[PDB]
Design a protein around this nucleic acid. Structure first.
Lengths: 110, 117, 17, 56, 120
RNA sequence: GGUUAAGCGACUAAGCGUACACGGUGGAUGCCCUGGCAGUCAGAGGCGAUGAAGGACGUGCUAAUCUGCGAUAAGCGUCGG
RNA sequence: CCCGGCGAGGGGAGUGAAAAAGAACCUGAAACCGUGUACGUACAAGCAGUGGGAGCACGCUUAGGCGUGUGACUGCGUACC
RNA sequence: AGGACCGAACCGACUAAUGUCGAAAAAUUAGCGGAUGACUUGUGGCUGGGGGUGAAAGGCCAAUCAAACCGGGAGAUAGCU
RNA sequence: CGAAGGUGUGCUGUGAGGCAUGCUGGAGGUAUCAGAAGUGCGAAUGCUGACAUAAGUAACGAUAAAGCGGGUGAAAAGCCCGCUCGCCGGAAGACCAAGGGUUCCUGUCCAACGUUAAUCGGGGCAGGGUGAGUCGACCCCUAAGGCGAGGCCGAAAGGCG
């Protein structure tokens, strides 16, 4: 059983959510939830929603007893970025990268 | 008859990158840099094919010298005895004998000393 | 994806004379 | 004022080694209501030292 | 270089800082409890209790001075009537600060500051 | 077997490196095309004051755009297929 | 059907020969950015390789070694046009 | 009465600081000059590039002026990089 | 019972290369011997697209200023209501022309846009909204100036009137 759970085109940048991912990597879901609950980042709530969805898929589509579940594979990879032109001084123009990322969560009992 | 070079270019680039595998940083990821490393690696390999012979030669001479000193004779004197005694054992063997068969190497110097005397 | 159109005149160099 | 040549991804990673966050690892359980909360903070539903404090 | 000095600046000039505490102090008295940033709550105490201590004893001069601070007739009426007697036997420490997590808008430490009352 | 002394000594990885495996980004390559390029063999070589070329605004069961059409307005009459 | 904010996005089900063909859709390369495993790295100086080479971790037939990955240490060595 | 005086609007831009990948492709802040006149301003006209206009600086003529801009001769020529 | 391409591995040639095969891929490919070239890229401050670097750094656009309660909401420092504080007040107020062209109002939505969040908006979607004998334009008259029947002049164009 794998019960993956992906959230693509997340608003936050891939880097900024990796810090949150490292906090819960390898840890049991029980401690994962509270850590994300009390972490002061939007990446915390962004990742928390994905982790909640992953637990729901495991409980519903697969075996119950979500208590004995651990986040085996947590990773983030940057996704498509949006190009925006922003004026600067002296009439110059620069490109603003509204970066996005895909968050993948894998929770397994063993 | 327009000719596209997309297929050929990747084939050439892969062939260089395969030889550049294992190098550090962009030297194994970037063709523009990997090509320099592959060429420079080729020069060193060509150069070292010759340096290897002399490095081993001097390594053997040191081993023979150490065995000769330990057993009471200089390396220069030892080689004279073999030349005078007409022994065509090379440095590689003499170093090999000294490491493994001490008794054999003792026999070598005794005749070398005898030849000098 | 338009390439920069207006390039400003370069800053005058220090007189090396 | 500007870099002479681009740093290496390794040198990039070494700089970020200190930017890693740390979990609080200090969750406290209320004596009466028994909910997890930060130490020296009121619970989400408003209990502290057992006795309710927000009355709401 | 801030050795033994007191009084948080709170990124405001003296006039703005004084007015804010005057307003926030009035709101605290009116409502008995308010949600505000922890540094503001701590600095508000040095402005709040001194009002209650003055209200413990009632006089024409004290009423006038209590009005000069907070510049509100409702607060002065609120004081000297029940806040006075309700804290007559209490020697300081009329305020209590409870931390309540962080503000979602800008992750500011928030805390409820409330007078020791409302034991119904 | 214990104590002391002397000598040597792996086990650490915050992070990073190389290799392999699995991914993301990205849209190269391969394949395809009612789109073009250049010709050959023919036609035609003008349209217009019985209003042109080119347009505007309208026109449907329907909001927009394209095509068609012009208050008879994605059409009308007649003769043929 | 389930998580989610009567969302975005995803997990099942279902259609299909194929859904890492899901409309951001044929094939899906490189730079670039990640996760996992093996090895090396916190007393050691420089075009980062090459020659020598211990150890370690994986595969072979043999029980002797060969292959793959890594590379302590050491000789030489100042990119390309 | 006054190309009179002090001084706002208005017009100007002498000094200093800030700002030079600035809020701004010459600005802001504090002072400064003219302010019934050779003043200033709205609207609409006229002067077209070997020309215009110029209380005259080679200044200005759509952020470009010791000869504007656009298209063409034109793939000008380059004993040079 | 799997073409080209893609990605590995194993062999082979003095070299450019060739051969075989695993995975992906999905329908084209092409021996041999000849013929024809837009026939081979690492550089040209080369051209186009994509992605790094600096770096989660500078910055977030007037130093007029915010505080609290309640409401809606998944979520409120920024939205609505209320109570205070502060700023402009020959303006940072109220009406027009010029110029924009629906930015107006109501309902609904929060991806993108707003240099943050957003339930909010000059954002997205739908509907509604501009009523004149007297206001203005049009209209009557004319200034500068334009055009200009004939006409005068000029290789033509055209110029002047």
């Amino acid at each position: 059983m794998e019960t993956i759970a992906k959230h693509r085109h997340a608003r936050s940048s891939a880097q900024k959510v990796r810090l949150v991912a490292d906090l819960i990597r390898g840890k049991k879901v029980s401690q994962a939830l509270d850590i994300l609950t009390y972490t002061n980042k939007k990446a915390a709530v962004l990742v928390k929603k994905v982790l909640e969805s992953a637990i729901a898929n495991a409980e519903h589509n697969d075996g119950a007893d979500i208590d004995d579940l651990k986040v085996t594979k947590i990773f983030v990879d940057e996704g498509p970025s949006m190009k925006r032109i922003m004026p600067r001084a002296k009439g110059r123009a620069d490109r603003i990268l509204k970066r996005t990322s895909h968050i993948t969560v894998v929770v397994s009992d063993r | 008859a327009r000719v596209k070079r997309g297929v050929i270019a990747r084939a050439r680039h892969k062939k260089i990158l395969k030889q550049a595998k294992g190098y550090y940083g962009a030297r194994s990821r970037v063709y523009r840099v990997a090509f320099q490393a592959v060429i420079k690696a080729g020069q060193y390999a060509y150069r070292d094919r010759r340096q290897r012979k002399r490095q081993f030669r001097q390594l053997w001479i040191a081993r023979i010298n150490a065995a000769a000193r330990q057993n009471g004779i200089s390396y220069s004197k030892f080689i004279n005895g073999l030349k005078k005694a007409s022994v065509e054992i090379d440095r590689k063997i003499l170093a090999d004998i000294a490491v493994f068969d001490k008794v054999a190497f003792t026999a070598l110097v005794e005749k070398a000393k005898a030849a000098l005397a | 994806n338009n390439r920069p159109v207006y390039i400003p005149r370069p800053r005058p160099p220090h007189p090396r004379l | 004022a500007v870099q002479q040549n681009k740093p290496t991804r390794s040198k990039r990673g070494m700089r970020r080694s200190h930017d890693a966050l740390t979990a609080v690892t200090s969750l406290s359980v209320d004596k009466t209501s028994g909910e997890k909360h930060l130490r020296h903070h009121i619970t989400a539903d408003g209990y502290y030292r057992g006795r309710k404090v927000i009355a709401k | 270089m801030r050795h033994r000095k007191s009084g948080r600046q709170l990124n405001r000039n003296s006039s703005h800082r004084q007015a804010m505490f005057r307003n926030m102090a009035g709101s605290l008295v009116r409502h008995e409890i308010i949600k505000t940033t922890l540094p503001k709550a701590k600095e508000l105490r040095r402005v709040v209790e001194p009002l209650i201590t003055l209200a413990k004893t009632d006089s024409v001069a004290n009423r006038r001075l209590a009005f000069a601070r907070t510049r509100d007739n409702e607060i002065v009426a609120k004081l000297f009537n029940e806040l006075g007697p309700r804290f007559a036997s209490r020697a300081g420490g009329y305020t209590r600060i409870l931390k309540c997590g962080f503000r979602a808008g800008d992750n500011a430490p928030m805390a409820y500051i409330e007078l020791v009352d409302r034991s119904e």
